[PDB]
Design a protein around this ligand. Structure first.
Ligand SMILES: Nc1ncnc2c1ncn2[C@@H]1O[C@H](CSCC[C@H](N)C(=O)O)[C@@H](O)[C@H]1O
Length: 275
């Protein structure tokens, strides 16, 4: 059960945008949310940015937590991985950028036994989780520490060697002013003609509506109780980031999932090389 729709035309698109917003968001509760979510202090916002890696690492050090997520994958990403593969067992090279404990990595590794995955995260405890997974295998997976906003992926990944990059619930954790750095870093490992598969929180997702006072860092940008952060993307903001860093939009769609979750799921192409 799914229904996919594309609205074209200035008037048609705007009318639908506002209709869907009003069906999730009470239109007067919009003003209420903006007044109630008062802004975190500059001092604390600086600390949260400086401690981005530390707060994720502390999250992964928790006990009493099932970090693993069944059904976290999607049919859409699996189909994208079957595209342009002549043989089911053909070698395919991927990067799972911001891999966490591997909830996207390991399901993808069971798709094609000659998938080779680079995988990186800035949390050392996440990387240890990856390396201790039952499915971990150095002939299938090269995992390494990398802060995507400032460590060059080329230190570990040969240039233009990757057939697909996954960027799944990662970019929303990055400061909006630094998101472009992440995509520029990724650009250099991706083969011309190949894509980033993106999925992340979207505007007016349930989580955004639940955040309270002194959780708001900025428009669409919140800190969670564990100090990690979530930005809630609009389609246009996300497309502009990718266009500004050299990609072409293929797919860029809101996903409504029923509790009304709002995600953005997208596919952005690195252009074929020219003359
Ligand atoms: N600047 C950065 N560089 C590298 N990893 C980052 C990062 N900012 C956030 N992360 C990582 O992004 C992850 C988000 S959780 C999503 C993990 C995985 N892609 C999945 O789909 O399950 C966390 O593991 C966090 O440590």
């Amino acid at each position: 059960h799914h229904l996919e729709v594309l609205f074209q035309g200035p008037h048609m698109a705007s009318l639908q945008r506002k209709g869907l917003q009003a069906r999730i968001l009470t239109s007067e509760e919009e003003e209420k949310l903006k007044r109630d979510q008062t802004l975190v202090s500059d001092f604390k916002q600086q600390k949260l940015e400086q401690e981005a890696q530390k707060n994720w690492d502390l999250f992964y050090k928790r006990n009493s937590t099932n970090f693993f997520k069944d059904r976290h994958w999607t049919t859409r990403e699996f189909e994208e991985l079957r595209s342009c593969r002549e043989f089911e067992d053909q070698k395919l090279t991927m990067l799972e950028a911001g891999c966490g404990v591997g909830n996207c990595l390991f399901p993808l590794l069971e798709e094609d036994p000659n998938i080779f995955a680079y995988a990186c995260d800035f949390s050392p405890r996440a990387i240890e989780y990856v390396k201790q997974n039952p499915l971990y295998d150095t002939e299938r997976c090269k995992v390494f520490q990398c802060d995507l906003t400032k460590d060059d992926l080329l230190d570990h990944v040969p240039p233009e060697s990757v057939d697909v990059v996954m960027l799944i619930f990662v970019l929303s954790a990055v400061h909006p002013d630094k998101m472009h750095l992440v995509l520029q870093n990724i650009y250099k490992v991706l083969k011309p003609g190949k894509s980033v598969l993106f999925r992340d929180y979207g505007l007016y997702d349930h989580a955004m509506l639940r955040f309270k006072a002194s959780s708001k860092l900025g428009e669409n940008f919140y800190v969670r109780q564990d100090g990690t952060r979530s930005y809630f993307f609009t389609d246009d903001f996300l497309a502009q980031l990718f266009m500004d860093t050299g990609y072409e939009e293929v797919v860029n769609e809101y996903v409504f999932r029923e509790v009304p979750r709002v995600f953005l799921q997208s596919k952005f192409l690195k252009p074929p090389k020219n003359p």
